[PDB]
Amino acid sequence: IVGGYTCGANTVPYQVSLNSGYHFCGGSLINSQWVVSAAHCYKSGIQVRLGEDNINVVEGNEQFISASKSIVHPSYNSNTLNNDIMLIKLKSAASLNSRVASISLPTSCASAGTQCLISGWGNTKSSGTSYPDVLKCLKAPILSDSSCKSAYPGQITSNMFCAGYLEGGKDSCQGDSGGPVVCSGKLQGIVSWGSGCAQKNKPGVYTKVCNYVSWIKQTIASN
Ligand SMILES: NC(=[NH2+])c1ccc2nc(C(O)(O)c3nc4ccc(C(N)=[NH2+])cc4[nH]3)[nH]c2c1
Ligand SMILES: [Ca+2]
Ligand SMILES: [Mg+2]
Ligand SMILES: [Zn+2]
Ligand SMILES: [Zn+2]
Numbered sequence: 001i002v003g004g005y006t007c008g009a010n011t012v013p014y015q016v017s018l019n020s021g022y023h024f025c026g027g028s029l030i031n032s033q034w035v036v037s038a039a040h041c042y043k044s045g046i047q048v049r050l051g052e053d054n055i056n057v058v059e060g061n062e063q064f065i066s067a068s069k070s071i072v073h074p075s076y077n078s079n080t081l082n083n084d085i086m087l088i089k090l091k092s093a094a095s096l097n098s099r100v101a102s103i104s105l106p107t108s109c110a111s112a113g114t115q116c117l118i119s120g121w122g123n124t125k126s127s128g129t130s131y132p133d134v135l136k137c138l139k140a141p142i143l144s145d146s147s148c149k150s151a152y153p154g155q156i157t158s159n160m161f162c163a164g165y166l167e168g169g170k171d172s173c174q175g176d177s178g179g180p181v182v183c184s185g186k187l188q189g190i191v192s193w194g195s196g197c198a199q200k201n202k203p204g205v206y207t208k209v210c211n212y213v214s215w216i217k218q219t220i221a222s223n
């Protein structure tokens with residue numbers, strides 16, 4: 001997250017860190033047994049870590065659980081990143097508490113203008129590499145589809161939305177990938193892609209979760 005702030009330990013209790021020997025992507029807990037992340041974060045051998053704040057120190061509120069299965073969206077296109085969402089089932093159900101909680105899926109989509117909270121342990125430098133150990137947060141509004149499409153002509157589909165600042169300076173970045181974009185209490189987006197990070201007129205692009213609620217509900221009930 002570039003231009004964000006330190007969230008504070010466990011202030012984003014539905015945030016997960018996907019680890020395959022090191023943190024490589026974020027995710028969101030939707031119920032005690034399932035996590036939603038991005039399909040471009042797909043790997044074999046994933047351990048999900050809940051209750052994290054400093055991912056390099058065992059501070060006492062973590063739960064490390066292995067995934068039993070991953071389901072990448074059936075229509076995910078790795079070239080365009082369209083339908084960039086994946087579901088991960090945990091081997092054991094997580095114990096939910098104040099520090100580990102699930103986020104709700106949306107009943108409708110959110111309007112341009114709505115402020116959201118984006119978080120993750122991704123890169124914090126636009127030009128450079130600096131990876132934080134504690135969770136970083138960023139509040140950004142959803143941008144109109146028109147400014148999103150002008151920034152990325154022919155690359156935006158109806159399953160994506162941009163959020164951010166056109167002036168640059170604040171954005172999610174690699175490492176934040178798969179993470180949550182929560183607006184008004186609902187998980188509205190998944191950190192998906194962008195052109196570098198925090199560049200002027202290059203906002204972040206997020207998977208539009210409201211278009212996948214029936215697929216998610218059906219998939220988890222049948223697995
Ligand atoms: N080595 C790894 N463990 C790793 C993990 C995730 C990655 N994801 C990318 C990316 O290159 O695919 C990537 N994910 C992005 C998310 C947001 C923005 C943005 N808002 N500017 C840009 C991004 N670039 N490379 C990655 C490398
Ligand atoms: Ca920790
Ligand atoms: Mg994240
Ligand atoms: Zn990138
Ligand atoms: Zn990359």
Ligand SMILES: [Zn+2]
Nearest residue numbers: 174175177192
């Ligand atoms: Zn990524």
